[PDB]
Amino acid sequence: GSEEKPKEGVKTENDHINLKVAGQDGSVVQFKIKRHTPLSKLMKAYCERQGLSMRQIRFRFDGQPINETDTPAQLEMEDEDTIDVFQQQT
Amino acid sequence: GTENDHINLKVAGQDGSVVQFKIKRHTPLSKLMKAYCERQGLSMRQIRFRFDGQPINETDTPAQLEMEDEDTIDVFQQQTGG
């Protein structure tokens, strides 16, 4: 119904952006996260979303693992950017 | 003239209705627009205030925008950056 976060308004961190996480390469999710904040803050969203250990899933960013600890800013994420999640049950 | 004191900004609501607002230069326009939202009933999030030809940010300031006490804040509802 509602949609916040600067629709493509990534300037200089501390200006929250929407983060898209693609899980199991079957669909996508759109998270809203600033940047300077570790991605591990985001990596659990998907979980609370799909029911994932958070630590068990595997995320990625345009050419980066973004090992949660990685903050979007540090890596240079953007609004609506995506972070692919690939984690089997094995 | 004006360094870090107040300055009046004219915010236009796309419909041709602009408003005057004194906002201290080094102050985030988020206040001036907050008054605009106050003036009517906008959301301030669904709104994007553009400065005389210059996308605006809640944190953007007249100084930061080289405005003055005789400039104009342009208003646009959702379209600019954040």
């Binding site: 300077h36 | 009046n8 209705s17 408003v19 004194k22 201290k24 206040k31 809640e58």
Partner: peptide, 25 residues
């Protein structure tokens, strides 16, 4: 997606100098 997004990040904005409001409109 359909649904909010929890995460809670650092601050959002900073105000160096203060100021009041006005009427008009």
């Amino acid at each position: 997606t359909v649904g909010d997004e929890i995460v809670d990040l650092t601050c959002e904005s900073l105000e160096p100098v203060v100021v009041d409001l006005t009427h008009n409109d």
